[PDB]
Design a protein around this nucleic acid. Sequence first.
DNA 1: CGAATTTCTAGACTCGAGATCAGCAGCTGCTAGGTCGAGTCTAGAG
DNA 2: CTCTAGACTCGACCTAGCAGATCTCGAGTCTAGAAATTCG
Lengths: 261, 261, 261, 614
Amino acid sequence: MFEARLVQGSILKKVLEALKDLINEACWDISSSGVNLQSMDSSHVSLVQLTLRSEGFDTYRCDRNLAMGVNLTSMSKILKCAGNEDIITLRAEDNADTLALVFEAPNQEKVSDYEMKLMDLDVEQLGIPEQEYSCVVKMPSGEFARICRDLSHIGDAVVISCAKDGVKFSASGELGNGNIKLSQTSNVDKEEEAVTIEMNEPVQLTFALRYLNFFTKATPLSSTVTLSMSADVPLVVEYKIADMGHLKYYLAPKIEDEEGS
Amino acid sequence: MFEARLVQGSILKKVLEALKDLINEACWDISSSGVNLQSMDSSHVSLVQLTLRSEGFDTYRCDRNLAMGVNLTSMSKILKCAGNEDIITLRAEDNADTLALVFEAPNQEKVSDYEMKLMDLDVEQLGIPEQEYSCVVKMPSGEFARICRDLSHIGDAVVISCAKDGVKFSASGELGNGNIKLSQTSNVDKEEEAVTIEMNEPVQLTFALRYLNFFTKATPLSSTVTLSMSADVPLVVEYKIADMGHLKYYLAPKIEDEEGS
Amino acid sequence: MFEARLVQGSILKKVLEALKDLINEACWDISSSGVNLQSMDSSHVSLVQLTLRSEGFDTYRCDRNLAMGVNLTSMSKILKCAGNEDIITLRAEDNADTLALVFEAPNQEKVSDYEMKLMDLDVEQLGIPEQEYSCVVKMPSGEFARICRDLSHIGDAVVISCAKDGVKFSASGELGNGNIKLSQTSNVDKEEEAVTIEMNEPVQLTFALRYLNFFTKATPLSSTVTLSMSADVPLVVEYKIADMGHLKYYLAPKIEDEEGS
Amino acid sequence: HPYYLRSFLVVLKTVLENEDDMLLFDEQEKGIVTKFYQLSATGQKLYVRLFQRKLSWIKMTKLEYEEIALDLTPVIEELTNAGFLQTESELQELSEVLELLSAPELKSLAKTFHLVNPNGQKQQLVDAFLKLAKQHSVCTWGKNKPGIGAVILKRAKALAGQSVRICKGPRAVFSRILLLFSLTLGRMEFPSYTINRKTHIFQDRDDLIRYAAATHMLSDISSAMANGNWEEAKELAQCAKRDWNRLKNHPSLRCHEDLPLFLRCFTVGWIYTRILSRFVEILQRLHMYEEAVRELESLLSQRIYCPDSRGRWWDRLALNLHQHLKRLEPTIKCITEGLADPEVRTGHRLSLYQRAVRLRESPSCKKFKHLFQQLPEMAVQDVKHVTITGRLCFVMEAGEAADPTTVLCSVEELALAHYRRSGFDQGIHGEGSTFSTLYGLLLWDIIFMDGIPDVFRNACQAFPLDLCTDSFFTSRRPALEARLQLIHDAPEESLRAWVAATWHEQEGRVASLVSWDRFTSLQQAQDLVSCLGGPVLSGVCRHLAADFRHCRGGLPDLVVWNSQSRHFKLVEVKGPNDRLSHKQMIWLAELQKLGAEVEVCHVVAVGAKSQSLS
DNA sequence: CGAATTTCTAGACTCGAGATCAGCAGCTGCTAGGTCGAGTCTAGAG
DNA sequence: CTCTAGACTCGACCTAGCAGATCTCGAGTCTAGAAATTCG
């Protein structure tokens, strides 16, 4: 029987919004290492993966590994009525049929239990590759989202261009053109309010702003977002889940059509 | 020459919006004892009663007991002009069909005056029987505010099975069932968190949550609900209006026979 | 080659807010003595005037006279993307159809530059009949915003009576009639509280209430508004932008026989 | 349609050969119609289709008429140059373009403006834009330019685009020519009637205009009654009454007075009377009954224009003074003279006697028995009430019970099935149509005897107008009786002759109101007259001719005659929750007086389920 | 105090029923159906 | 013998449809913009 007590339920709470608009069904690979999640997006374009170490949990123990599925949509509506400073004690029995909620209160005066119906999914595992990237960018995550919705007004395609002194965010729409560049600043002691880009080889790609808007949903996970880019490689947008874990995104680059011809 | 001067304009603000969604027109039974409203709902299912003692008003006068039928819907919009801290000065004059509302800013730099139009409404009186009940609880208002809403996601027919050790406000639906059980608390320093229950005989009845959601619009009025129940007797939901009045709500229990159909 | 740099970019942000929807296209007339904007609405009903001086600019130079037409909506899309504290670096090239909008970071870390397409309007030498106004009213902008907004629901036109005892706002509708009047401030020395009225002869005119909302969008610009009236003259609403200049709102009075037929 | 090309052209080429037609049209209109004639044959169709269509601005982009060409536009500019299809051109009228304008782009134009509630319904948006006409004080704020509505229509045309419309003159002249052709389709083979047009109906070209003015109004008032908006009708009817008042002293109606009653059918006063007649039901429905009482009084002063009108006004006075304006002292005076007026007869009057009986028995008028001592009587002998059953929906189980199929039906088959198995196979129904059909063939040339003025006025007439009026018989009182008594003496074989002959002599030839389907087979008709003969139908027609206005129908619905066994089973279809009207047996009483076989057939309310009970 | 969160509100999209149109029906009177004030029958009390 | 309330009846009273396709439309529903709120 699996029990996971998490003092910081807010971290668990705010995960679901990022996965709502892009994921509906998923499987939770649960082991003694912690909580794992891999699920291809509904549109079969971008890949979203989640990992949590067990050591982050206040209480955690899992005798036998389980891969079980629940609709993401249902669980967030349940988690809607919960508060941010509560104590949660995620618990699941061996025979995977229901999920019990052990919601607690900071004053330990009000407790509420809810029961979730589980469902079965086909465990489709895809082996992601691990490799070095050409241009890797770490920069304030809140700033990254702020850039996106400006360029969304112009078009749905931002030219990623790792340059000598930052990036060359360029949106090309029918109404006009939007070019945004940020100076590479590292002298700031506050690493959260700083950008660091490592140079291996310049590489230029373009991505659909539709997924970037969905990817920016995870902005308050961490104050900074790390972007790793490489030639003919899916986009990497990673969010560190404090010390609890990490959350990174895949999105295959669009094939550059021969519009010049 | 009816005149009522109440400093707390917000409480007068607070009473109207609760009445907007259930009643279209009503008869205002005012007397030297004070303002009394007895108006069964437009949907002809629930009953709402309101009484304001004259002494609660800062300045109250009533030469003759009038009974005016005023359009309830339009009142809030005029009231929406009134500030959260203005001194209202309810006043009626002779045999005219106009009510005088004056809004005074606390600094006495802004004086707002307004005039509405009275209509003719039949004075229909319904007998009010006084009796005791089976399950009586003093239970916090903000507590139930979600409870009607949270289980409104499950179904529209709760089966209350009040017992000796708390509440069993269960629900059900096609997606599943919502089962919340609050634990009775007595050793609380404040009376705003006490859920003390007095039992003589357990009762099991049923309601539609749509009205329950409507009955929760009066949450800002107070923080201590005096809802009660007995067998085959309409529900009572009474709100103490500070030291100004009392707001009681009536709703007959839903018969379990229609649930079979 | 025109290039004007204003430290307070929020002022340029606020001015578009009122002009964002009230006017759709206009000519940006610029001279060596300052900025002056003047155009007409699609309904040929109200006139907007700008008197931005060259003194208010931190750094100003306008080598030759320009008068250029650009879309109002396009500009508002850009002013929204700049913070309330960026330094505007407006720079317009001689007959190049390129406006250099640079939003300078007070932090000196981000660089924000934007260019937009330039269109071609037409000038119609709007006549500005200067005339004295019998009733001159100066009173704070915030209070003005309420009175125009509050009376919007009750009716569609207002009969303004310049009473020497205090200006009165009266509006009538199918809901009834409501009149609001104030008292001229005597002892409160605060300029944001004066209700001073200049009286030469009482005047009673009528105007459309569907525009007062549009004009009151300039409340963030200034704390006090000035309204001047006489017999058969347009309504004037003037906002004093510090020492930068004044903007005046023109509104020809509603004809008295429009209600007759 | 090829029908429309031949039809309108036939109308024109037939109305051409009338010297009065040219007499009543100016040389200008003659040039107009000739310049239609020289117009292209394929260009005729465009004006033909639009003429018999609503008068409103329409975009050719909306139009889809293809049988001329997908690009018949050159015909459009040609006919526009002809001076008929007024194109966009002179269009400075905001209301008309708004009418052309459609709601969606109307909503878009609302969006680009500031007007209050730019989401409403079609008309109030239209007059909202019309309130935008109230200007020239805010438009004159700077430069004067009062054409704010001009700007409105400019942007509307930018939204709308092109349109066409017809000038009033051509439409008016073709309206006149068509009504002249009508005078109270090309496939129709008209009968063997030649022509007898002698006297012109009207007296002047000015007089006919007022009919054209009135005819438009009369159709307008007809629509007003189907609206509930008689209030606008009265004001123009007042003007029409004023138009009457102005033209009350006009000699044109005196010549109509000189005209026979079948030519009196339409008259300046009579038109105005029928205008004022509708005014009465305008008045009564809005409950101004007292004026309606007043109108019929002045109506009752006149009797000449449609003598079959005074009786209606007698009922008007009774109805006005009974149902709502209870006023005894007049209504007794009314009902007395009402029962006595010659034009009041049959059902029109027999209802009044029962009305008199019902009124006198009432306590209100029970006091005035002394004024009710002149009551006639119509003692009846109600025909044997054969009360039958059968399924109802109606629904028939005709055939074997093994096939109780629904096959929706009427009350006829129920009795028909009952009577056909009663040895009365043939004979379907048709009240008095068949008797008129019998009357038609045998007396045809006597019926259509000519030489009398305007018997066949038009080039297309079938009935000589006076067919409705009793003066038809008075014209041929000697001629009819000679032929009538001959039929009375003619044997069955002889009847077969004039039946079959006139059936062939006038086959295809338009048989006025005569219905060939009544005689499903000509031999059946010849077999039918083999069952008929002499007094059987001769008695009928004696009643028919003079008493014609008031006796078109009411005869026994079913006719059910045995084809081979002579004996017929004439039947009045009836039943419970129903009864025979006062006039209804006036057929049967004299029918049974001549020993007809009319059989009252009541019908028990019997449903599909009901028979399963037994 | 700013931003998120939630709510509120209006603008956009769906559907099914209402109105109209054209080449002909309207012959308008029988049929069905819902209605109403008066006449009539009956039961209980005087 | 007479006055009154209720059921059956009967005779008066009034109103829609014609003929299939065609737009046109008028309410019903959702989600983004607008805005209060509220907390560190």
